[PDB]
C-alpha cells in the first residue's frame, strides 16, 4: 500500500475521534486488531484516559503533544513508544502547526476511570465503523476504507 | 521511551547497513525480533533484494525512494506498508534532501538471490550487534543501544 501525502491538509480524510482530535486511517487489519493513522488536533486537544493492552509507536510530524503521565512533550521529529499496559491521557497544545502524529496502534483501547477502572473500549471494528460512516458522509465513499484493509 | 529529534543531523547516531544506506535504531525488541529506526541515504542508495516474513511500515520524512518491485516512489509525507512475504529491493534517489524514513521492521530479513533463493539473513541480534559496535566506535557508547531495549 502506498498513500501519498498521508498527513494531508484535506480535512475530509480525518475522522472525528473525540471532539478535539481526529484521525486519518492509513492501514487497518481487522484480524490483527491493529491500524496506522495520522492523529490530528487543529487546536488544544485531549484524548481521555485509556490503556492499550499492547505497544503504541508514534512519530511526530508537527505540533506539540504528550501524555500527562510522562514528563516529555513531543514536537516535530520526536519518536514515542508507549509501553503496553500503560494508562494515559493524550493532550495536544496550540502550536504554530496543528498536532499531527503518525501512529501504529495495537488495539483495543480500554477507557479508564477517573478512579482507575475499565469503563469502555475502542477496537478495530469500532474504528472501521466510524471511518466508513464518515467517509460516506464526506463523499470519499465508505468503500475507500475497505481499500485500507490487510 | 521518548527520543527527541529522531531523524537527527548528527551522523554518529547512524549505523552503516549497506555501503550507501545507514539506520538510527530507535527501539529494539530482542524478544519480538522487531525494531523501529530512521533509514538514511545521503546520496543514491540501494538495499539488496530480501523479503520480510512479516509486515513493514514506513513514513517518509525526506528524500525520494521506493522499491523496484512496485510502481510508486515515496517523497516527504508518504506512507508505505509492505505486505509480508514480498521480496524487494529498496532504492534511494539523489534529492535536495537525504532519504530519511521512519521504519517499523518485523525481522528477520532474508536476503534473496539474483535467482530467487534465500542466501543470507539479518535478524535483531545482528542489528543489536552492529549498533553496539558502531556506538562504541563513535563514542556514543555500546550501552546507549541497551537503552533502546523493550
Ligand atoms: Fe493511547
Ligand atoms: Fe525490506
Author numbering:
A (entry chain A), B (entry chain A): 27 to 176
Tell me what the authors wrote about this structure, in their words.
There is evidence that the enzyme is a homotetramer of subunits and its sequence suggests that it belongs to the cupin family of dioxygenases, which have β-sheet structures and are known to play key biological roles in metabolism, biosynthesis, oxygen sensing and DNA repair. As a bacterial dioxygenase, DAD plays an important environmental role in the aerobic catabolism of aromatic compounds.
The structure refined at 2.2 Å resolution establishes that the enzyme adopts a cupin fold forming tightly associated dimers with a pronounced hydrophobic interface between the monomers. Residues 60–132 of DAD form the core cupin fold which consists of a double-stranded β-helix forming two four-stranded antiparallel β-sheets that are a characteristic feature of this superfamily. Interestingly, in DAD both of the sheets are actually six-stranded owing to additional β-hairpins formed by residues 40–55 at the N-terminal end and residues 135–148 at the C-terminal end of the cupin motif. One important and intriguing feature of the dimerization interface is that residues 28–30 form a very short region of β-strand (strand N0) which takes part in the dimer-forming β-sheet of the cupin barrel of the adjacent subunit. One O atom of the putative carbonate is approximately 2.0 Å from the iron, suggesting that it is datively bound. Instead, carbonate does fit well, has a high natural abundance and is known to be a metal ligand in a number of nonhaem iron proteins such as transferrin and lactoferrin as well as a substitute ligand in some dioxygenase mutants. The modelled carbonate is located in a position which is highly likely to be occupied by the α-hydroxyketone group of the bound substrate during catalysis.
